[PDB]
Design a protein around this ligand. Structure first.
Ligand SMILES: [Zn+2]
Lengths: 44, 250, 154, 186, 69, 40
């Protein structure tokens, strides 16, 4: 149905928008795990 | 204690002034195929064609992983003097780097001893790191971006939990839509070096790499088309179908 | 998996193969960095998280293993091409023995592979002579049939 | 690592260039110039000033205890000359051009009992492994390309223990044997 | 063992043949997509809740190690 | 005082590593989720 396809698009848009929230998390979580190791490995 | 915090700031400044002096002398005195530039308080340098290092003392963008490492890196340089390693375990002997004193009389080679003494000082130990901190980003963003751009197969990156400066370990598991079990296929361990990345392919092939972002993106795309072909082979193994002529490359 | 379980699995690994000796330092947090010595031929340092190995630096017996202290210093590669090639082969071969379902087999599967390396410098390859085009001896064991044909050999 | 020092005897000087040419066909970069020096004493004892170990001095006997000592060990000998007979007959020094080939560090130089230059010495030290005798099979096949039809069957310096460290020290024992043959004849 | 597979690879073939023919006229595969996408989002949010409480828990101890200095 | 200060640096590091350890397992499970995202 045409209307059903519209709801899927709305779900995809919400899921796609939620994915954008998720990608920033990894970059932040990734960045932190990067930074901690670089700071520590150099420890004296 | 108000007097305590006042003194601490002064001590930090005196140390900070030393750090820039150590970089500032090193940059112009020695050359490492890089055009360092000196300004009042900014030591501008170009480790990569697309990078600009603003190591700028600020008196009264900030990575804080490179910045902090300077403070700690200097101590290792300071520590190399007047350390416990210098002193000889045998009571009678001249002061010398313990590992060095046991190197000469234990017949170490011409190359290893020279390598140990060839420490690069300060600027090279940080430029090379910034030469890796962002090369990681260009290889990390591309992998992250490639997953969104291409939805047919799913790039998967399991990043290692121990990635010390001057190196980073990668996992790549290029699987199709949801067929992880039936179809597990080429997965390469990419290695982010200081100058160039290094991958080892699933089948056994080793590809050195280029340093530019574009070259990496091409490699993944080339491995993209390869997997879809491998999906045919895996289905042939598990489907009622039987194999015919194969052409892995061209 | 629990930190204690990691020690038991690797301690069990040492029992099967007499030549191999495993040292568990664990300098970093709950990520075993076992060190394996193959009798006298070669040494190796492998980092692993939660009993799933992800790296292998095959440093020869000659080369030093630590840097300035008990610090294992996994990164420093070998100064010889032969061990450098084995490093890539160990880096690549480690993957091919990964079974996502079971953590115990992958470690054991990798060790029998490493155990097959005790005979390096002494086994000709089935395809051509012991010594190949370049300056490397076999440096390539098949995953299932334990052959000796080189990197250039298939 | 593991080495097989040997000598491969008209046109002795031309032999090195021809022998180097055979090495050049395989392809090996000129990465330096090695210089091994031997010194001789009465009671005897030899101190082997070896290159690629700039610090080590490598004092040695015919068959007995060998110590590895830093460069300063020589200063003891010159100052200790009073109780010994220093520089008794002649010092044999062999200097040649280093040809390190894809981790084989194979070098060939003309041994010069200064200034005669009567012999040729081949250094085939194979860095990777210390285990040598139960690994000897590798070195031979590398040799067969370098030299022709007169490969040294075995260096004979290996006592064949159950577990065998070789290290660099026993190589200097091998060098001495080559020098002994050179000194004995012509 | 070989008889096992071929008779089974034939069995799924029949159902797989139905699937595409059953994809066309009904809306069920779209309906399953509605549920699967909804389930995927629900799992996503559940993972978040695991993240925040753990992240907040760490935020507390790190602050605690700071007030003690 | 040098003794008591060294303990604090070792103490915070020990807790600091555990933060990195727990983030590693937390990142790993999350990292898989993003790539698993279907149709987006
Ligand atoms: Zn071969």
């Amino acid at each position: 149905a045409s209307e059903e396809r519209r709801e899927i698009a709305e779900v995809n848009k919400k899921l796609k928008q939620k994915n954008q929230q998720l990608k920033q998390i990894m970059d932040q979580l990734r960045n932190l795990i990067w930074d901690i190791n670089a700071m520590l490995a150099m420890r004296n | 204690p108000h007097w305590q915090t006042k003194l601490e700031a002064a001590q930090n400044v005196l140390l900070c002034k030393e750090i820039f002096a150590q970089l500032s002398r090193e940059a112009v005195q020695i050359k490492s195929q890089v055009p360092h530039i000196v300004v009042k308080n900014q030591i501008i340098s170009q480790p990569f064609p697309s990078l600009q290092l603003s190591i700028s003392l600020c008196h009264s963008d900030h990575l804080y992983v490179l910045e902090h490492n300077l403070h700690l890196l200097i101590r290792e340089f300071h520590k190399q003097t007047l350390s416990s390693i210098m002193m000889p375990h045998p009571a009678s002997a001249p002061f010398g780097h313990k590992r060095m004193r046991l190197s000469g009389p234990q017949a170490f080679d011409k190359n290893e001893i020279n390598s140990l003494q060839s420490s690069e000082g300060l600027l090279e130990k940080i430029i090379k790191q910034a030469k890796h901190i962002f090369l990681r980003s260009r290889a990390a963003a591309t992998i992250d971006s490639l997953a969104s751009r291409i939805e047919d197969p799913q790039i998967q990156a399991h990043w290692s939990n121990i990635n010390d400066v001057y190196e980073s370990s990668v996992k790549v598991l290029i699987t199709s839509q949801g067929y992880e079990q039936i179809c597990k296929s080429i997965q390469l361990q990419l290695n982010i070096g200081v100058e160039q990345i290094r991958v080892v392919h699933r089948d056994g092939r080793v590809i050195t790499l280029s340093y530019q972002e574009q070259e990496l993106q091409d490699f993944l795309l080339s491995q993209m088309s390869q997997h879809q072909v491998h999906a045919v082979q895996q289905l042939a193994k598990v489907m009622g179908w039987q194999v015919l002529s194969f052409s892995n490359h061209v | 998996l629990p930190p204690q379980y990691v020690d038991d699995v690797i301690s069990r690994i040492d029992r099967m193969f007499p030549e191999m000796s495993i040292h568990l330092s664990r300098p970093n947090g709950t990520s075993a960095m076992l060190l394996v010595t193959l009798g006298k031929v070669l040494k190796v340092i492998v980092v692993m998280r939660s009993l799933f190995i992800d790296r292998t630096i095959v440093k020869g017996y000659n080369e030093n293993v630590y840097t300035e202290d008990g610090k294992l210093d996994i990164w420093s590669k070998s100064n010889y091409q032969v061990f450098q090639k084995v490093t890539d082969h160990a880096t690549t071969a480690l993957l091919h023995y990964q079974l996502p379902q079971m953590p115990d087999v992958v470690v054991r599967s990798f060790m029998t592979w490493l155990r097959s390396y005790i005979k390096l410098f002494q086994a000709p390859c089935q395809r051509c002579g012991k010594f190949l085009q370049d300056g490397l001896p076999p440096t390539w064991r098949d995953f299932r049939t334990l052959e000796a044909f080189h990197d250039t050999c298939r | 690592g593991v080495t097989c020092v040997s000598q491969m005897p008209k046109s002795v000087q031309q032999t090195v260039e021809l022998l180097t040419r055979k090495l050049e066909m395989l392809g090996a970069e000129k990465q330096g110039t090695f210089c091994v020096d031997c010194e001789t004493y009465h009671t005897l004892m030899y101190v082997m000033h070896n290159s690629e170990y700039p610090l080590s001095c490598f004092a040695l006997f015919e068959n007995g205890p060998c110590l590895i000592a830093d460069t300063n060990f020589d200063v003891l000998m010159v100052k200790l000359k009073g109780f010994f007979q220093s520089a008794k007959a002649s010092k044999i020094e062999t200097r040649g051009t280093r040809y390190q080939y894809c981790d084989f560090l194979v070098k060939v130089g003309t041994v010069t009992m200064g200034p005669s230059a009567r012999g040729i010495s081949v250094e085939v030290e194979y860095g990777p492994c210390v285990v040598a005798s139960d690994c000897w099979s590798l070195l031979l096949e590398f040799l067969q390309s370098f030299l022709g039809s007169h490969t040294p069957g075995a260096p004979a310096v290996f006592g064949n223990r159950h577990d065998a460290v070789y290290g660099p020290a026993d190589t200097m024992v091998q060098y001495m044997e080559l020098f002994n043959k050179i000194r004995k004849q012509q | 063992q070989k008889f096992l597979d071929i008779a089974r690879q034939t069995e799924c073939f029949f159902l797989q043949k139905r699937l595409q023919l059953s994809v066309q006229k009904p809306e069920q595969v779209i309906k399953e997509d509605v549920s699967e996408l909804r389930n995927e989002l629900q799992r996503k949010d559940a993972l978040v809740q695991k993240h925040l409480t753990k992240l907040r828990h760490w935020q507390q101890v790190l602050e605690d190690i700071n007030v003690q200095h | 005082r040098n003794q008591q200060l060294r303990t604090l640096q070792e103490e915070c590091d020990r807790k600091l590593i555990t933060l990195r350890d727990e983030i590693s397992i937390d990142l790993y499970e999350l990292e898989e989720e993003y790539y698993s995202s279907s149709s987006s």
